[PDB]
Design an enzyme around this catalytic site. Structure first.
Site, PDB file in Angstrom:
ATOM      1  N   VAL A 169       0.825  -1.203   0.000  1.00 23.14           N
ATOM      2  CA  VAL A 169       0.000   0.000   0.000  1.00 23.14           C
ATOM      3  C   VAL A 169       0.869   1.266   0.000  1.00 23.14           C
ATOM      4  O   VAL A 169       0.447   2.288  -0.542  1.00 23.14           O
ATOM      5  CB  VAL A 169      -1.034   0.043   1.142  1.00 23.14           C
ATOM      6  N   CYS A 314      -1.933 -15.564  21.394  1.00 18.90           N
ATOM      7  CA  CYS A 314      -3.301 -15.608  21.891  1.00 18.90           C
ATOM      8  C   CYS A 314      -3.375 -15.430  23.412  1.00 18.90           C
ATOM      9  O   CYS A 314      -4.211 -14.665  23.895  1.00 18.90           O
ATOM     10  CB  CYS A 314      -4.016 -16.877  21.444  1.00 18.90           C
TER      11      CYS A 314
HETATM   12  C1  SAM Z   1      -3.986  -7.503  11.324  1.00 15.23           C
HETATM   13  S1  SAM Z   1      -4.364  -7.899   9.623  1.00 15.23           S
HETATM   14  C2  SAM Z   1      -6.084  -7.321   9.436  1.00 15.23           C
HETATM   15  C3  SAM Z   1      -6.629  -8.004   8.182  1.00 15.23           C
HETATM   16  C4  SAM Z   1      -8.106  -7.738   7.856  1.00 15.23           C
HETATM   17  N1  SAM Z   1      -8.371  -6.289   7.598  1.00 15.23           N
HETATM   18  C5  SAM Z   1      -8.987  -8.251   9.008  1.00 15.23           C
HETATM   19  O1  SAM Z   1      -9.625  -7.386   9.646  1.00 15.23           O
HETATM   20  O2  SAM Z   1      -8.995  -9.505   9.235  1.00 15.23           O
HETATM   21  C6  SAM Z   1      -3.474  -6.591   8.693  1.00 15.23           C
HETATM   22  C7  SAM Z   1      -3.175  -6.931   7.235  1.00 15.23           C
HETATM   23  O3  SAM Z   1      -2.429  -5.870   6.590  1.00 15.23           O
HETATM   24  C8  SAM Z   1      -1.585  -6.441   5.619  1.00 15.23           C
HETATM   25  N2  SAM Z   1      -0.520  -5.490   5.315  1.00 15.23           N
HETATM   26  C9  SAM Z   1       0.505  -5.106   6.145  1.00 15.23           C
HETATM   27  N3  SAM Z   1       1.294  -4.205   5.617  1.00 15.23           N
HETATM   28  C10 SAM Z   1       0.772  -3.991   4.347  1.00 15.23           C
HETATM   29  C11 SAM Z   1       1.166  -3.151   3.281  1.00 15.23           C
HETATM   30  N4  SAM Z   1       2.206  -2.324   3.335  1.00 15.23           N
HETATM   31  N5  SAM Z   1       0.416  -3.170   2.151  1.00 15.23           N
HETATM   32  C12 SAM Z   1      -0.660  -3.969   2.110  1.00 15.23           C
HETATM   33  N6  SAM Z   1      -1.114  -4.804   3.048  1.00 15.23           N
HETATM   34  C13 SAM Z   1      -0.352  -4.772   4.153  1.00 15.23           C
HETATM   35  C14 SAM Z   1      -1.115  -7.746   6.252  1.00 15.23           C
HETATM   36  O4  SAM Z   1      -0.677  -8.631   5.242  1.00 15.23           O
HETATM   37  C15 SAM Z   1      -2.393  -8.218   6.958  1.00 15.23           C
HETATM   38  O5  SAM Z   1      -3.164  -9.003   6.059  1.00 15.23           O
END
Ligand code: SAM
Ligand code: SAM
Ligand code: REN
Ligand code: REN
Lengths: 339, 339
Positions: A169, A314
């Site tokens: 992103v 967890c």
């Molecule tokens: C804690 S998870 C939350 C996932 C989802 N929104 C949910 O609520 O289940 C955060 C997500 O952000 C993604 N992520 C982290 N850094 C990122 C980046 N720079 N660009 C895109 N995705 C990213 C990770 O791969 C992960 O899938």
């Protein structure tokens, strides 16, 4: 028992029972509370503003198999805090309730273009796409596996209004704008918040809204890292020191490019119940999980390692979010428009 | 003793001693604290956001003689919280220390154009004009007497870089912009905050800064008005119900047109010591004060009335700002740039 190595050693051998493990992690969080709370509001603000100013100066191929994820998490593999109405609410119901909460607070309406940033396994993307057939829903993830999972689920649910952008992103460039942008528990991984928010605003128009949900502490911000040599936990869980826990109000200071419209928090017992549900389901499916992991891991000991890491996450998450009945660490939510 | 009228009656007769008066006002403030603090942060935010949203929907010829003001207040007749380094700091020294605090936090530099909104008797205008001879300093006040006082003081101190705009700030229209805008304890009287901030931004350029200092509660916002029929104090002090006490963070939600750069609070003991100094100086000069007021007031009883109002304001302000050692009501300060 002193020494990081010693505790790490016993932990990996399953020689530390749940009760002592919990007690140990809780004391670690207690010390972060002592570090974070200042005696006067004048000092608390000085400390908080110093953290925010420091933020403003800042500028693995191995992925778990989806069959393992299905055995530990709920039905849509949500990897964020869920919302539990009851004592007996199941993880599947809590996933759905949290999806509906987001749609309500982000003011999702049929017909809008929606972007979900860091969409994970796409639970929220699939929920909005299924409920609002005239919406076009785009997920953005940096994970090829996640993209492939979401597209497959969309095909099985007969959804035609889903796309997935595969991108980091922070590097993604685009002229496209969206009526609604959602950022669910992704901001904690973002290294440059001011730049992140600025980019988000360029993907918005005057009619768009931006909804952000992030893990928080109610009063102060902190990096998720060890205070001292007694804390084996922080560095075990996040071996790369780049997770930030913002205070519940930290984003109020990042309104260069967006303007706040509403702000909520959700008590930490919801998150605590979430991680407890994952831990219990993992424990229940333990045999199956070890079998699933073995191929891609190579040894029974590497399997044990990945399981210990997840289970301890967890157990620690439980102690963190349930602290003082959910009134310390929790989830903050904000709604913004473009400025 | 029940009944508003009864307490109001004894109060005007000087039949309520200081100790009982203080005790009574303190209990009134205790009840506002009970009204304002919610059991969970989720509820506290809901309550705070409801107040802020309500704000966003919102859209006397008799002046005390300056010789009276000189007999009650400090040397520059500052009518805002002052800053006390010591136990023995005098009101005159506390006035100067607070002026220097504002200049430091507002980043005043020689050469800038400065506007002080609701400048009162112009203590801050005169301080900046005298210290920074290349600044041009404009005060804005809705009081003809205040304007005339400031201009006279400027003439006596040989200051050539002072002007005063006589205007209601909510109606003033102008193309002029200023490097620095200061708003010291005026925002509590402003009925439309969103409109106020918006107007301020049109008097700024990309290089300007805006500094605001306001009385606050650290946690919640409230109108300065009675909760119940037991509170004789609020309506006695401000008989027109249009004073708002914003929480320390309320202005963070009014960044449509300005963007925050820094945020502080000053412990309420400074304000408490300020009002205590005014009360003690008034008491010391009581005879002289009554003589000064008599002409323009007509009766010894109307004099007594104005003195009771002022002295009770001081006694009540003491109890409010000193509550919990200054950790409830206090002063918040913010620095912004144009958005
Ligand atoms: C804690 S998870 C939350 C996932 C989802 N929104 C949910 O609520 O289940 C955060 C997500 O952000 C993604 N992520 C982290 N850094 C990122 C980046 N720079 N660009 C895109 N995705 C990213 C990770 O791969 C992960 O899938
Ligand atoms: C609490 S006093 C603070 C005065 C001064 N800044 C000081 O620190 O001593 C607030 C001032 O705002 C002025 N004021 C209130 N409403 C105003 C308005 N609409 N336009 C201009 N001045 C106003 C009052 O006359 C009063 O002098
Ligand atoms: C390994 O990757 C993962 C990261 C996070 C979670 C669950 C949950 C969460 C729970 C926590 O307690 C925590 O610590 C402060 C951080 C996070 C990150 C946001 N969120 C989604 C699950 C994961 O599988
Ligand atoms: C009658 O006009 C006046 C109004 C206010 C003050 C002193 C001080 C202050 C002290 C208080 O305790 C208070 O209540 C919450 C309000 C205020 C208003 C801001 N400030 C300047 C002095 C005045 O003469």
């Amino acid at each position: 028992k002193e020494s990081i190595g010693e505790i790490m050693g016993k932990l990996m051998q399953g020689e530390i029972g749940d009760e002592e493990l919990s007690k140990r992690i809780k004391e670690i969080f207690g010390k972060r509370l002592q570090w974070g709370y200042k005696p006067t509001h004048q000092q608390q603000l000085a400390f908080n503003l110093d953290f925010i100013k420091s933020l403003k100066e800042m500028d693995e191929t191995y992925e778990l198999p989806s069959a393992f994820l299905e055995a530990a998490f709920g039905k849509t593999i949500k990897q964020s805090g869920c919302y539990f109405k009851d004592e007996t609410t199941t993880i599947d119901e809590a996933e759905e309730a949290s999806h509906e909460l987001y749609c309500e607070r982000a003011q999702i309406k049929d017909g809008q273009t929606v972007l979900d940033i860091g969409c994970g396994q796409g639970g929220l993307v699939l929920h909005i796409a299924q409920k609002y057939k005239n919406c076009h829903v785009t997920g953005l993830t940096n994970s090829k596996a996640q993209k492939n999972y979401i597209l497959m689920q969309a095909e099985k649910l007969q959804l035609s209004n889903v796309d997935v952008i595969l991108a980091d992103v922070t590097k993604h460039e685009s002229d496209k704008t969206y009526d609604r942008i959602l950022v669910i528990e992704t901001i904690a991984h973002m290294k440059n918040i001011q730049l992140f928010m600025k980019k988000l605003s360029t993907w918005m128009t005057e009619d768009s809204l931006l909804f952000v949900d992030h893990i928080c502490h109610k009063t102060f911000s902190h990096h998720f890292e060890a205070i001292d040599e007694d804390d084996w936990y922080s560095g075990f869980i996040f071996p790369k020191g780049c997770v930030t826990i913002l205070s519940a109000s930290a984003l109020l200071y990042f309104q260069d490019d967006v303007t706040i419209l509403d702000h909520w928090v959700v008590n930490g017992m919801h998150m605590a119940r979430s991680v407890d549900a994952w831990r219990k389901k993992l424990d229940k499916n333990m045999e199956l999980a070890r079998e699933i992991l073995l191929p891609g891991l190579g040894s029974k000991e590497a399997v044990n390692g990945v399981i210990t890491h997840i289970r301890t996450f967890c157990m620690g998450g439980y102690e963190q979010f349930s602290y003082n009945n959910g009134e310390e660490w929790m989830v903050a939510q904000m709604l913004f428009k473009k400025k």
